[PDB]
Design an enzyme around this catalytic site. Structure first.
Site, PDB file in Angstrom:
ATOM      1  N   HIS B  43       0.525   2.447  18.298  1.00 63.74           N
ATOM      2  CA  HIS B  43       0.070   2.116  16.959  1.00 63.74           C
ATOM      3  C   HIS B  43       0.952   1.076  16.284  1.00 63.74           C
ATOM      4  O   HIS B  43       0.562   0.496  15.268  1.00 63.74           O
ATOM      5  CB  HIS B  43      -0.036   3.365  16.081  1.00 63.74           C
ATOM      6  CG  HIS B  43       1.273   3.872  15.563  1.00 63.74           C
ATOM      7  ND1 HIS B  43       1.951   4.919  16.150  1.00 63.74           N
ATOM      8  CD2 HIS B  43       2.016   3.491  14.498  1.00 63.74           C
ATOM      9  CE1 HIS B  43       3.056   5.162  15.467  1.00 63.74           C
ATOM     10  NE2 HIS B  43       3.117   4.310  14.460  1.00 63.74           N
ATOM     11  N   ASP B  99      -0.480   7.678  22.327  1.00 53.89           N
ATOM     12  CA  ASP B  99       0.189   6.671  21.502  1.00 53.89           C
ATOM     13  C   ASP B  99       1.477   6.251  22.213  1.00 53.89           C
ATOM     14  O   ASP B  99       2.559   6.739  21.895  1.00 53.89           O
ATOM     15  CB  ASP B  99       0.522   7.288  20.142  1.00 53.89           C
ATOM     16  CG  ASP B  99       1.018   6.279  19.145  1.00 53.89           C
ATOM     17  OD1 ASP B  99       1.429   6.704  18.039  1.00 53.89           O
ATOM     18  OD2 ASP B  99       0.994   5.070  19.457  1.00 53.89           O
ATOM     19  N   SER B 198       8.271   5.013  13.287  1.00 56.38           N
ATOM     20  CA  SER B 198       7.290   4.909  14.372  1.00 56.38           C
ATOM     21  C   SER B 198       7.889   4.277  15.611  1.00 56.38           C
ATOM     22  O   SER B 198       8.616   3.301  15.507  1.00 56.38           O
ATOM     23  CB  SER B 198       6.101   4.032  13.953  1.00 56.38           C
ATOM     24  OG  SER B 198       5.281   4.643  12.985  1.00 56.38           O
TER      25      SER B 198
HETATM   26  N1  LIG Z   1       6.165  12.601   8.851  1.00 53.74           N
HETATM   27  C1  LIG Z   1       6.136  12.043  10.060  1.00 53.74           C
HETATM   28  N2  LIG Z   1       6.587  12.719  11.110  1.00 53.74           N
HETATM   29  C2  LIG Z   1       5.607  10.679  10.252  1.00 53.74           C
HETATM   30  C3  LIG Z   1       4.875  10.029   9.222  1.00 53.74           C
HETATM   31  C4  LIG Z   1       4.391   8.726   9.457  1.00 53.74           C
HETATM   32  C5  LIG Z   1       4.637   8.118  10.708  1.00 53.74           C
HETATM   33  C6  LIG Z   1       4.139   6.738  11.001  1.00 53.74           C
HETATM   34  N3  LIG Z   1       2.867   6.867  11.704  1.00 53.74           N
HETATM   35  C7  LIG Z   1       1.711   6.512  11.108  1.00 53.74           C
HETATM   36  O1  LIG Z   1       1.704   6.076   9.976  1.00 53.74           O
HETATM   37  C8  LIG Z   1       0.407   6.669  11.845  1.00 53.74           C
HETATM   38  C9  LIG Z   1      -0.152   5.259  12.214  1.00 53.74           C
HETATM   39  C10 LIG Z   1      -1.676   5.417  11.980  1.00 53.74           C
HETATM   40  C11 LIG Z   1      -1.720   6.374  10.784  1.00 53.74           C
HETATM   41  N4  LIG Z   1      -0.590   7.305  10.941  1.00 53.74           N
HETATM   42  C12 LIG Z   1      -0.470   8.550  10.352  1.00 53.74           C
HETATM   43  O2  LIG Z   1       0.518   9.233  10.553  1.00 53.74           O
HETATM   44  C13 LIG Z   1      -1.558   9.091   9.434  1.00 53.74           C
HETATM   45  C14 LIG Z   1      -2.344  10.232  10.115  1.00 53.74           C
HETATM   46  C15 LIG Z   1      -3.159   9.707  11.303  1.00 53.74           C
HETATM   47  C16 LIG Z   1      -3.455  10.857  12.283  1.00 53.74           C
HETATM   48  C17 LIG Z   1      -4.211  10.292  13.520  1.00 53.74           C
HETATM   49  C18 LIG Z   1      -5.517   9.584  13.090  1.00 53.74           C
HETATM   50  C19 LIG Z   1      -5.237   8.495  12.025  1.00 53.74           C
HETATM   51  C20 LIG Z   1      -4.488   9.102  10.816  1.00 53.74           C
HETATM   52  N5  LIG Z   1      -0.935   9.631   8.223  1.00 53.74           N
HETATM   53  C21 LIG Z   1      -0.203   8.776   7.287  1.00 53.74           C
HETATM   54  C22 LIG Z   1       0.366   9.649   6.200  1.00 53.74           C
HETATM   55  O3  LIG Z   1      -0.294  10.587   5.759  1.00 53.74           O
HETATM   56  O4  LIG Z   1       1.488   9.425   5.760  1.00 53.74           O
HETATM   57  C23 LIG Z   1       5.370   8.819  11.684  1.00 53.74           C
HETATM   58  N6  LIG Z   1       5.817  10.058  11.435  1.00 53.74           N
END
Ligand SMILES: N=C(N)c1ccc(CNC(=O)[C@@H]2C=CCN2C(=O)[C@@H](CC2CCCCC2)NCC(=O)O)cn1
Lengths: 34, 250
Positions: B43, B99, B198
């Protein structure tokens, strides 16, 4: 083997028998506590 | 990283920063697994819902770092990408299943006190270390809270969570290629990865041979360090064969 030789051994720690501040917190969890 | 602390020098020598050429900013974390290969989350490169789709020439790989923004002269090593490989079955459309991505460096990087590769797990090691309650380490230069950034690389030690508990914390469809980690609401301690982390490595130190192994890749979550929610990571070993397949052929 399933990973190149020397990998995972940090120069400033394992290679000098030095421990980082919180690695013991990890090893302590590989038993039954946490 | 939320509720973590400053990492010490040479504590995570495989930690890699994915840097964008223009503009110039932190894009993602990643890890060094050999002199020519770096591991990260897909991602970070491809994600259509946000019109995200980087190519070899849009990125720079910065190894050996500690400071988030400074150019650590004589210490860090900036490398260019030769080829990027996204997992053919990466599911960006539904749940970010698989991923994971590999990046081929143009030229081998020379190791040092601050640059050293982490190990990839083998069946035995993963089997013994990947268990609920066992703690792993996550590192990054990502956000310090859900809604600024760290000055220096951050580190947190988090326990792996029971698969059932992970499934009942979200409406998102979990799969075998991922696991979650974090403390439960009544465990007193907290912490979590967050935006910007990430692609970062989730590692564990083997009690058998003292080596550090990378078990996961920072993948996703819903918010950051929210009670009742957990962070999800790509299950590195489950995808180990795709990895060797790629390295042995390319
Ligand atoms: N608290 C944690 N452990 C965390 C939070 C954010 C990220 C960064 N990763 C992302 O942002 C990914 C990239 C696509 C969207 N995404 C998400 O984590 C979505 C959830 C996704 C789940 C899979 C399908 C698309 C939405 N949530 C963002 C949020 O609520 O802050 C990594 N870890």
């Amino acid at each position: 083997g399933s990973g190149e030789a020397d990998c995972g051994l940090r120069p400033l720690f394992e290679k000098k028998s030095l421990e980082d501040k919180t690695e013991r917190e990890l090893l302590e969890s590989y038993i039954d506590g946490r | 990283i939320v509720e973590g602390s400053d990492a010490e020098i040479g504590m995570s020598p495989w930690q890699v920063m994915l840097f964008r050429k223009s503009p110039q900013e932190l894009l993602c974390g990643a890890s060094l697994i050999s002199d020519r290969w770096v591991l990260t989350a897909a991602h970070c490169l491809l994600y259509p819902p946000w019109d995200k789709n980087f190519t070899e020439n849009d990125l720079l790989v910065r190894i050996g770092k500690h400071s988030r923004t400074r150019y650590e002269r004589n210490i860090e090593k900036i490398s260019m990408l030769e080829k990027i490989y996204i997992h053919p079955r990466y599911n960006w459309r539904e749940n970010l299943d698989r991923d994971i991505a590999l990046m081929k460096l143009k030229k081998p990087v020379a190791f040092s006190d601050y640059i050293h590769p982490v190990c990839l797990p083998d069946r035995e090691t993963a089997a013994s270390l990947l268990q609920a309650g066992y703690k792993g380490r996550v590192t990054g230069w990502g956000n310090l809270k859900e809604t600024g950034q760290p000055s220096v690389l951050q580190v947190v030690n988090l326990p792996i969570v029971e698969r059932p508990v992970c499934k009942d914390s979200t409406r998102i469809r979990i799969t075998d290629n991922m696991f979650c980690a974090g403390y439960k609401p009544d465990e007193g301690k907290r912490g979590d990865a967050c935006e910007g982390d990430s692609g970062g490595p989730f590692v564990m130190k083997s009690p058998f041979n003292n080596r550090w192994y990378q078990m996961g890749i920072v993948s996703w979550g819903e918010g950051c360090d929210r009670d009742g929610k957990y962070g999800f990571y790509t299950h590195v070993f489950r995808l180990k064969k795709w990895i060797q397949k790629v390295i042995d052929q390319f």
